[PDB]
Structures are given as C-alpha cells and as structure tokens.
Amino acid sequence: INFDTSLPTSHTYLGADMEEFHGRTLHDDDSCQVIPVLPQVMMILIPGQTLPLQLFHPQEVSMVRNLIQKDRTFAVLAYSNVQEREAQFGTTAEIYAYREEQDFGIEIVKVKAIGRQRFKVLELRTQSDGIQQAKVQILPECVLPSTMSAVQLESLNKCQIFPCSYKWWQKYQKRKFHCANLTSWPRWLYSLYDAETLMDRIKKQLREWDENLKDDSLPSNPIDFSYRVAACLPIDDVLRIQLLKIGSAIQRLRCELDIMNKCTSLCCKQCQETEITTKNEIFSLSLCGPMAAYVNPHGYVHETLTVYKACNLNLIGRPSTEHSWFPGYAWTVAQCKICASHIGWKFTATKKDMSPQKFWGLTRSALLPTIPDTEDEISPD
Amino acid sequence: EFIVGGKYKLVRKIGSGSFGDIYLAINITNGEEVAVKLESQKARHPQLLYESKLYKILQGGVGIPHIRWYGQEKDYNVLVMDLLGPSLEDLFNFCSRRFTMKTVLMLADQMISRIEYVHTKNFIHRDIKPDNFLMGIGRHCNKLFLIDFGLAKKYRDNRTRQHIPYREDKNLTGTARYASINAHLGIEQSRRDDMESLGYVLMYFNRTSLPWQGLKAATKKQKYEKISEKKMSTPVEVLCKGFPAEFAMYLNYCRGLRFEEAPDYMYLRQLFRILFRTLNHQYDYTFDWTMLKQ
Amino acid sequence: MSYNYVVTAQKPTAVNGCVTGHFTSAEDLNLLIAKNTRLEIYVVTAEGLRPVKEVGMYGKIAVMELFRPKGESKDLLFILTAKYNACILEYKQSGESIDIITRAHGNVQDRIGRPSETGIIGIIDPECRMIGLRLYDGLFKVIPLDRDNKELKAFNIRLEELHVIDVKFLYGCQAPTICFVYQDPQGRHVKTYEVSLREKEFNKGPWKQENVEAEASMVIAVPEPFGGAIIIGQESITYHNGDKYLAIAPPIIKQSTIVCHNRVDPNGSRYLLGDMEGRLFMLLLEKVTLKDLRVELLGETSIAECLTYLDNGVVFVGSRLGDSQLVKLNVDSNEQGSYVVAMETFTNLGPIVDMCVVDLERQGQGQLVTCSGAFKEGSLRIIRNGKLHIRTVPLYESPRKICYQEVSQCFGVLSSRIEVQDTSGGTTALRPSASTQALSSSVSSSKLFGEEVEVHNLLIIDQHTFEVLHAHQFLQNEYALSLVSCKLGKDPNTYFIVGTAMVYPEEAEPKQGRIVVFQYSDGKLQTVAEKEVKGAVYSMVEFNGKLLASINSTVRLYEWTTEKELRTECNHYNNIMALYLKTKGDFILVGDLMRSVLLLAYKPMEGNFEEIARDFNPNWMSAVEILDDDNFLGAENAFNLFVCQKDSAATTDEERQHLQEVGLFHLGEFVNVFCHGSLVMQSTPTQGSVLFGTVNGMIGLVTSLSESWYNLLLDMQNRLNKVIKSVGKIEHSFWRSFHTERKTEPATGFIDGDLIESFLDISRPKMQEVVANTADDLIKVVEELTRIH
C-alpha cells in the first residue's frame, strides 16, 4: 500500500507529454447532432470517464485530425449487439489531449478523450469513405429538488440548516424528513431517495476499496459522484447500458448501491459458472477507483479492475514490464482454467520494497457479475 | 507486419522443419506469446494439416501442447500453439553435452509417460529424438512435452483395437541415430519401436555419443547401412557397459517385444524409479540446467 | 386524448399565514388569513370575527404582509405566490360593491437560482422603503417601494453568507438594515447589513457579527424604544442591540423548538411564542434600555403554524396540523394563574393522509372518512353532503391508514404514537391517546435516555359511535405500512390484513416485515395467521380472491389455503420498488416515489405476471390511481396532476409497451390519496368519480368528459379568462401550467371546474360577453356540472 495512485491516470506508458486543450464543447439538451464514430472503439463510455486511444489506420488518423480542427467530439456507441453494430444509446467523447508520431514511416495518433454527454441514437449512416456518422439526440440530466420541497411547513423552514457519524445521520433524517408525517410514507423511505444519504452509503463501500478520504478525491455533486462510481463498477455491457439509460442521479446512485450489494461474485463470462474473484478482493490502485480504461500497444482498450486475489486462472509465459499500465509492476497473461479465455493479467512487483507485491488486473469484457446462491439478475432503479 | 489468425503478430524465427519454420508470435490483444508453425501451401513435405488433426485427438493429455488456431494466411498454412521452452538437445548443449544419472532418470520417467499417452490414443510417434522433447515455460518449466506429430501413424483401430498388419520392405521414417534395429531392417514400426528409440535417447545422454554416431558416408543410403550394421553388431551389454543394469534391462525388454505387443510401461518406469531411490535421489526437479542457472 | 374535469369539493382548511392591520378601513382592525390559494378577510369585533371578504388567487400564497407607506390612508397587502408572482393589493368598497384592486404586480423569479433550503423569506422595511426577499442561496432580492414601481422591478445583492437561516429588517435605523442568522464551518453567527437602494448593494451593518447558539433559528426585530433584535435557539433567547447583550436560557423552552411568534404590545414589550408541540409562551421585555428577558408558559393550543394577537386577550392560532382556534388569554387577573381558554374552533381536515368512502347511513349517498392531522392533533373526520357536514373524532395520535369492514360494522385504522425512552428501561407515552385508551387491547408476541420512539397500532373503531373498541400494538421497531379488509380464497370470513416493516436506525433498507391476518368477530380481535417476509410490505391489494403484496422491489401473489395460511403462488421481480399498487380486473399498476409507472397482467394459464407497458419520467410521485382500463391518474412534484394512457391496439410492440402522457395540470395541492367514490346521491355529461385528499385538507374530484364537452368548456375557459378579474393580475394559464423548477408546460387534458363554476357568480353583462358565439343556456350546463359534488 505505497505504489502512487496518481501514476495509472497519467497513462505514462503512452510516451511523451501530449498537446493539451483547455476549451470545452457541450451541446444543448434534447438537441439533435451529427457526430462521427471511431470504427474500432468497442467500449461503453460513461460521462467523466477517461478514454485513451492509439489510432493506426489512415482513415482513423484523418478523422481525428479533422476533429482536432472542429469541436474535438466523437460518438462512442454503447453496442447492444457488437457483431451487427447495433446501438440505441451512447456517449460523446471530447479529445482533451493528442500526439501525432511518425513511428516506422507511418503516422500514428495517440488521444486522451473524456465522456461528456449521453445520447439516444436516431440514425447511423456509413459514408462512401467507410467512416460512419451518428444522428444523435442529447439526453438531459434530470436534477430533482429535495423530496420534502413540496411537503415542507413554512414555520420549520428555519430548522432546515443543520450544524459519532451514526448519531448525526439519525438527526439529519429526523430534521430533513420531519414533514414526511404530512404524507403517506415514513422518514426512512425518503432517506432511500436522498442524494446525500445514498452518496454517504456509497462512500462507505468506496472506503472499503481505497484509503483516500472523501474530503478531496470524491465529488460533492450527485451527478458527478454517480458518474464517477458508474465508471468503476465491474458490470457486464447489458447492465452498463441500463445504467447509461438512467437520467436521474438519485436513480443512478440507488442502482449502483444495489449492484454493490447484490453482485458479490465475479465469474468468467464465457463459463458463466467459473468464479474468478469477489467484491472483497476489489481495491483501488488508481485515484479513479478500482477500474479504469487503458490502451495496449496495438490500440486495444481494456477496462482493468485491480483485485488482491483471483482463482481459476492459469498464467501464460513469464512476466514482462513492456508497456505496463502500472509502472513498477510486470504483467503475465492470465486465462481461465476451463475455457482458456483471456481474463486479464497478474501484476508482480519488480522491487522487493513495493507494496502490494502482487495483484490481478482483470478485463471487464471477460467478467460476469454474479448473485450468490440461486437467482437471476435485476438492477432496481 | 505479419499477422496470422487475425491476432498473432510474428516477432522472429525460433526454429525450422520439413514443412517450413517456427516463429515467436505475440497476441496483439493482450501480450500473450505463442509459437506459430508456418508451412507453404505447395510445400514439398506437407505435415501441418495432419499435425493439426492429430493435436485434436491428443488434446487433454498432460505434456501435449494446446493449439490456438489452424488456418491459412497468404500462401501459408498456419498452426498457432503454446510457446514451449528449449528441447532436450538444447539443454544437453547448455550442460556441455553431459547429463547426470539424476537428470537422465527424472527425464526417463516423463518420456515413458509422454510416449505412453500417444500410444493410448492409438498412435506411434516414429520420431523419438532429444529435439522433440521440450520443457515448458513458466508454470510448465519442469513439465516435458513430446511434440512434432508429422510422422505419427495409427497402429490400431480405436473401437476394435485391431493392430496394423505386419509389413516389411518399408523405408526408414525418422532420424537414423535413434531408429530401432527393426525400423532399419524395413520392418513396420509399432509401439515397441518408439520404446526402443527412447532407450537410445537415454544412452546418448548417458555416454556423450553413441557407438554408430561418428560414421560418415557420402550418401544418406550409405550413412544408414553403417548405423544399422553397427547397431546390430553392438550387443546391448556393450552399449550399456559401465552404466546401471536397468538401461540394458530396458533395451533388452523392448527388443524382446512382439510386433503387436503392448509395452509394460509400469515395469519400465519402475526400473528407473527403483534405481533413482537406490542412488538416494529425490524428484525435487533440480535438473543439471536448473543448477547452471543457480 | 383523456378529457378530464377537476373540481374542488372542499377548499383547503389548513392555515399557512395570518396578519392583523387596517386593510378594509383605517378605523377597522382586520384579521387576514391565508389558506394556500384562499385569502379570508375579517373585522375583529369584541364578540369575535366578522367575515368581510373571501377571495381566491391563481397561486399558492408564500408571503402575505401588510404595510402602510407614506401618504396612504390605510394598509396595503403584499403577496408573493410559490410561482414567484408578486403583487400589492388594496381593499375598496363603494356602497355594497367590494373589490380587491391590484396596485402593482410582477414576476420576481430569476432565470438562474437554487431555491433556498430555508424556503422563501419575505420582509418589509419598517419605513416602507423596500421589500426584501430571500428566494435563492447567495442572493438577496430587493423591490424598491415607490409609486413608479407598478411592475415590481427588483435587483439582487450578492450575499457571501450562503446559508441564511432567518432575516428581519431592524427598527430605529436611518438606512434600511437587515439582521440575520447564518451558518458557516465555524458555526452560527448574527450579522447586520445596511441596504443601499442607490448603490444597489450592502454596506457595513450598524453592529459587529456576534457568535450565537448552534441551534439559533429565529430573528425578532424589536420596535422603538428598545430596538435591536431577539435571537431564539433551542436552549437560549439572546438580545443584541450592538454593545448591549442580554442572554437567558429558560428550562421551560428546552422541551420543544419555538417555531413561531407574534408581537402583542406595539412597542415590543410582550411577544407570543409557539413551539412544535402546541405550547404557548409569553416573552416579556422589562424596560430607554432593556432591563431583562422573561418567558412564561401560558398553556396549550393546537400545533401553531402562525400566531396573531387580536385584542382583549384574544389570540388567533393558525394551524396546519390540527384545527385553528380563537383563544382567550387571562394574562392579568393575577389571583388566578396564566391560562389559555379556547373560544372558537375552526375545522381543519389537513393533512388528509388517507381516506375511504362508505355508505354508512342513506344506503345511496356516500360519506368520506379521513385520517386527518398528525400527533396530538390526529383525528378521524366524517364528511357528508348537507354545505359539507363534518364530524370530528380526536385520537391524540397520528391516524395513518383506514379501511371499512361492513361485516363487523367497524373501521380498521393504523395509527402511531410517540413514546419517550425511560431511565428504568422501556418507553413512556406523552398523553393518553386512542391506542392507549381502547376498551380492549392486545400486543404482538415479541422475539429474541429521553429518545422518541414511534409505536404502531391497529385500532378497531365502531362505525356508529366511533369508539375505539380494540387496539392491537405491533412489535418494537415494527412499522405498519399497509392495511386491507377482505375475504380470501374459499374462506367466508372477512379479515383485516396488515403489511409491516422492521425498522432499525443502523439499517437503511428493511430486510424484515410481516403480513398479519386479523379477524375481528364476536366483539374480539384475534391474529389468524402471520407470514414473515424478507422486506417492507409497502402495499397490498385484494386481487381476485388472492392477496397481492409488494415486498420491496418484489410483487408477490398469495393464495389463502384451507389450512388458513398464505401460500406463495407467484413472484415478479421489478426494476423498481413497488410503492404504489392498484388493480383493475387482472391488470396491476406498480409505481414508485420517482414516477416510474409499470403495468402488469396476471396470466392465469401460466400462473405468473407479464409486463404490459411502462413509463419512467423521474419526478416525485405522491399518489396514483387507475381511472379505467386505459388511463392512469397520478399526483407529482410541484403540486401537479398527470394522466398516462395505454394503446392495446398499436401495430408495433414498442408502442403498445409505452405509456402516453395525455394530461398535465398544476393543482396547487399535494395529493396523498386517490379514492373512487362520490358524496352525491347515486344521461350525465361526466363519467367516473375519483375523490382525492391533500396535505392542506382540500378535497377534490376528478371525472372524465367527452371530446365535445372538453372542447366546449376549454373555449369557455379562454372566454372566462378575458372577463374574470384575477387578484394580483395572475394569468389562469400561467397558474394551471404544469410546473417543476426545470420545466413549465401549459395544462393539457384537464378542465378547471372551479373556473367553469365561477361563471355562475359573474354579472349578467359579463355572462353575455362570455356567450357571444344564450347565457341562461350556459347556466344550465354549469348547474349540471355543479351536481357532481
């Protein structure tokens, strides 16, 4: 527990410092926009999430040069069916850093993008160049007032500002939700739909993963907090699409808490029954949380979840430090013992003084969140 | 530049064969290192499709490498498989052409088991030589693999267990150095011949060389007439002189087998296991090469 | 696509404000009462109150203040609505004709702004130089009071203190000065600012920022000769005039938070204080300088929202939770103690938390029985058509749910009471109440400080006498949520079924709950069966001889066995928490607190549930009802009503599993309950009748119309709006527009029955103006529409 959590976020394996942009582009809510799609991007991007890319193909390089001159925004499709390139939703990605390199006589472009706005796909058109454009509708972010705003007594308005955290939360609930007695429901029900309470319940689980304090690292805005947590939850694509479809931060935070409590096991997606790890082994080796997207030397993007222990995995080959996403650690390819599907990599320290000495980086695309005992899957809110 | 199976990029040549070459390749999606056997379509000596089929039948055995993909890329047939460590000939060279009785005996145990498995799957290997026995990598570094199934032949029907007919007038298959006496006489190869070849491999690690090794002749047809006659003029007791009796017991047993007769693998493993115990050795996986790396 | 008609059956009864002054005449003492959208004007007489005028506004009254500027013969009235409509009103009478003329008006909402935590604060300067408003955090809105500000133009001053608790304008200041309590990381402080109208900013206040009590909530500006300000907290009452600081910590005020006040004497010698529990105190100031502060407990009143001293010891108590009162104080007559005597009581049905329609007497005409009030104010109210005739049954605790059981000739009422923790280990009640005063009582069998504990109960109340025959107490930490009266399976018996939740402060989501089946027969309550479930039973419905219960996000169907036990038939795991449950035939309406609406159908041939359609538009939803097979009525955030519709005929499967929003309306009330029924005697232009009960004690009615009737009444509305004089010059369309802070849409699929009905009250020349395509032909239409309630 001494690595330097600021290291993976820097993406130092990408080389020399990239050119940075300060400007920002946001489209009006509910507006219709035509945005280009990067052909080989397969990730489901969450607003506020960092996406590194290495573009090799001349058509991809050209498209990015054009974006860097215009709004710097591309569409990242949330694929329902990846094979037939089907998508109903997606997220805009704004390039904030770039670097053009002439590696081996070929123009290569490295990019760092960030998720900005959620959208509904209205139409997809592939042009005569092979590069496709998405006719999109910008999905608004629903901000609700306190559930008590329409049910508060004017005489108790001067009691709404408030000065052993459990005793504090008990008083928070009694005072904030006092006027719940004018309604059909108790204070404890309103708490289950209260942003601050829901965020404090999430923080308690995030502290279980990282020893960094809420004070600085975690945002105060429910929208940003909810998106920051959504980005680092190791769930399958069908669940992530449902999570992306949520417009209210309350519903997003509730839905996250439910996933965090229900899904305790992580199995191999190909096997569905082979257990790889549990939520108890999840830990943050990055400021972003336990999981972030990294790009490999050939431009393959992996959302890599860091865990202390993993089982049912075979190690292929010997360790390597080449293009390591966690500087100071060497990687060894890890496959499932049953189906031999690539699950991730084992990371082993190069120096004896380093802690942890070993951990596993599992690629989200290979995992399947599992409910213990015998039941199906459901994401409430 | 050269990508096979959509994800394996060729790094460098790491070997050769009758078919073509063996390359180190890297899975561009995750960094995984693999071996890629490349064979020209319209090659003089094709074996890759046959090997790919034979690896399907042999899959599941320990010491049998895993096949990732078989297919075509450009004007080549491609076999993508497990990257394995060095061969016994590479390790013999590394150890200055000298192995201790402890290494030879630990190896012998795994080599009988490797041939035995191929035999349970109704095949004879027909090319038993130090070069076809490779140690694994990483987790598999003390596990020996028998590879190169291009000369492998079915010796019996899977259901009926009917053995192949007895033929003579067969040209020799495999390397002449470790070939059985009967394979030299043109007699058809069976289980006994793989076992007898293994005895030569062990004697070759024991004595730096074999009695018929330094026999030169202009043509390959003349090169074999000497090896064959030297093998036949050399009694097992002369070849195995100064070595434990078990090595002569092994070769005499194999040469005593009938054409269709199954070797008693337990008996042959036991000869070496009882010797290993008697010499006060442990199966600690400390081979000669393990030590040179310490 | 729906065509609905919404009309008030009973106007709001809850009081949110009251002021005294000289509004009707410079010689008359008035009592002005705000009842949400209603404003009542009274003349204070020696006998009591003389009703003078009652007006309705196209808005929810947030601020109501009287003021007498320079040159004015009598007081004017400032009103700010919840939709930010500001106005200055004048009373004018000529002979018999009375009119509330509009002097100035305008909308004061900002295009940017976080509506404040402490809500809207509206203060008027003692010299009538300006109106100060705190609508949004980090800003103070100023409306200069001039004759040339008929549009009510305003500017904002930046306020560095982001968390303002309370603010008042001080007396005896050369420049307008605000005094306020705020909170920052260090704690609570009192600060002053001068207000420059020229500079449109704040200047250094007359006296320094003083560090006050952690729970300081109330600021009282003392008039001359005292001056300065009184600051009230949970333990202390402090005085601040700059250099002068006088503090008192009376133990008498420690029991409950003081949440309202009123000045008695014009020089600020005496003040009335009211706490959250109905205690009435007198704050006295001994006198150029203030010698000392004193508190005196006068006695008990209804939980006061607002207090107003009238004259001759008479005080009007404005209540939101219970009945309003006129109380006589006997402050003097020093041989007898200080005591409060109630002279008059004024019916308040609010909050209506639940209700049911019962045909008790006439066997044709329906009666409404509500769960009204909260805490000691809790009661049952029996509402019938005579004006509306209301009977009151005090419970002295909170009624929560109600259902009638014809067979046993009684009502089942879920109630709750607060008990305080003991030194001996246990809990003590605060007063006797319905659940501690039943003629027979029972307790559930248990398993395994001064803090408030909520105890839940099932009351059996005789339908004739309204006596509490039996009270059944639930387990410690058990919260009773849902109540049903029904027959199940092949069982001839009628049962009372209670759905509960186990609530512990450490657990956020309930992991335990019970479904308790009771039988009230031969004048005795017995527990027939009990099923323990792995969650909170939020809702239950008798579903075709079976019991449909919602356990958290699950919808479970139980069968009643011959062994008199509940047997799980099927489950349906929902994407949402099944808060609201409604059934019509084999159709089920599942909703949540966030307006997630789901439609399910029981498939008897498969023995499971199938989703028909859904609609997820995040907003707070307070109630839902099935109008018919295709229409769903709901109550949602910022006092709106909505209608959702299905289309079982649609060619595409995306369309037929989509619910269309067909009606939107700003009601101005918060609905807790929707109830199918009528209060009128059972070729009509209306179809159906859904009654609803609100937080303010308002009772409304929703009915469906034909396209022809809707189109006629809609045109009639636009015509009526051109002729009717709106108090404060508020547009009806603006008022009725669907409202949230993020969006404002015009009302659709709803006719304002209150507006249509007001055609009967307009003059004959005005009636003729409306019917200019015959006025008597329209009177017939409108009189036919009045007959539905």
Ligand SMILES: Nc1cccc2c1CN([C@H]1CCC(=O)NC1=O)C2=O
């Ligand atoms: N060296 C090489 C060659 C081809 C593909 C790949 C690599 C390295 N790697 C990953 C391995 C884990 C890591 O931490 N960083 C990476 O970049 C690949 O996916």
Ligand SMILES: [Zn+2]
């Ligand atoms: Zn697997």
